[PDB]
Design a protein around this ligand. Structure first.
Ligand SMILES: Nc1ncnc2c1ncn2[C@@H]1O[C@H](CSCC[C@H](N)C(=O)O)[C@@H](O)[C@H]1O
Ligand SMILES: Nc1ncnc2c1ncn2[C@@H]1O[C@H](CSCC[C@H](N)C(=O)O)[C@@H](O)[C@H]1O
Ligand SMILES: [Mg+2]
Ligand SMILES: [Mg+2]
Lengths: 219, 220
């Protein structure tokens, strides 16, 4: 992995500058005892560019952690735009709130604390959709079901992005016993059979373990 | 590279289906002595998806080869959409025209034969722009100047994509002797310095050699 990390540092040195709010969001993970699993700086910038191509005014994120990915995307929003992010762990949600406040995004970002599978039908009842872009990055086994709820909260042209769908190439092992690999494989099979979207999977290398993100556009 | 190749085939079995027109465009290369350097199927679907996000009506492509990338992007267009593709080699242009005709894309694709640096100022003079998406994929040394012309043919929100800007990590080598590597390094420096766009570089692995594509959006 060394060449991929060195090339990622080359790219972030040109195009992946992180202000105090993004660095503080990263620094908050270890002091809070949270896992070091945010998107990378360059992945962050890529999510921001996708939100700009979507001309996104309304973004939904499942899985906030410390709000690193949230800050990157919310920075693409217009003044009147909104990002709703779902986080199960009340400690993660409190840390993310501090980090979003430090980024001056309190007004545009709403953190909802609970399981995505409980909150997604709430968003349906509220008529919270449709969203211009949806980022699925929570627990891995129910990605397939999160995608079905995302469709209910989409319009034609909505972008749905799902992170961690390759898992170091372990998705090739049909006999994998790892929950996160089985979750990825089931989601990828659903995505291959889904006639409601146009989709691809991007292999991703860099500072993080070899992985990939799925991208889908609602027909 | 074996794991990346195996994962790419896994991905294209799910989401990278190629019809006769794309398979025929690939098959056309060997009989014409052309390099097997088109975008991969999965890269082709990615460019198609970027064109759909752009809601592209007008696309510009530098470097046609056999029209493989051209067919993937043109298929995102509405019928009244147009794609202009530039190609220096008349042998390549004639193969690409056959492949575009086979794909049913004759109305939507205009292949222009000559040096990109000669045609781009003609496009500005004709008012051919602005393009919703621009794909820079010709010879590598003038990438920096192709990008300057692309900005003259853009509007706010235009997506510019440049292929082959990592070259197996050789862009880390400040003493590279390879003009294509030197061209990518100069392009990536320019892109780092450019205040007219928001940009990133995506590292790309799969069936082809380790490389990367630059994505830039012209600021609003
Ligand atoms: N059922 C569930 N609903 C919502 N969030 C969940 C969940 N199960 C786990 N999570 C949360 O999903 C997150 C995954 S990590 C998210 C990383 C973040 N998007 C970033 O890149 O910065 C964790 O914070 C975890 O607590
Ligand atoms: N100065 C120049 N102007 C225009 N095209 C050029 C050029 N120098 C090289 N080319 C052409 O650029 C092409 C690069 S390969 C293009 C591959 C194609 N985009 C695909 O993915 O399917 C070759 O066809 C080459 O002949
Ligand atoms: Mg993730
Ligand atoms: Mg190329």
């Amino acid at each position: 992995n060394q060449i991929f990390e060195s090339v990622d540092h080359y790219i972030s040195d040109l195009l992946g500058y992180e202000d105090d709010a993004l660095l503080a969001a990263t620094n908050s993970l270890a002091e809070a005892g949270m896992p070091a699993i945010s998107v990378s700086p360059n992945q962050g910038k890529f999510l921001q560019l996708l939100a700009q191509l979507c001309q996104a005014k309304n973004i939904l994120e499942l899985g906030t952690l410390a709000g690193y990915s949230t800050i990157w995307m919310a920075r693409a929003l217009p003044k009147n735009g909104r990002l709703i992010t779902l986080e199960y762990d009340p400690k993660h949600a409190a840390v993310a709130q501090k980090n979003i406040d430090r980024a001056g995004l309190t007004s545009q970002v709403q953190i909802r604390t609970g399981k995505a599978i409980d909150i997604l039908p709430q968003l349906v009842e509220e008529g919270a959709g449709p969203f211009d872009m949806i980022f699925i990055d929570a627990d891995k086994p129910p990605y397939t079901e999160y995608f079905q709820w995302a469709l209910r909260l989409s319009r034609p042209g909505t972008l749905i992005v799902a992170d961690n769908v390759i898992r170091d190439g372990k998705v090739l092992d049909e006999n994998s016993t790892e929950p996160a690999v089985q979750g990825a494989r089931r989601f990828n099979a659903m995505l291959g059979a889904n006639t409601a979207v146009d989709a691809t999977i991007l292999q991703m290398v860099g500072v993080k373990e070899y992985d990939g993100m799925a991208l889908a556009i609602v027909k």
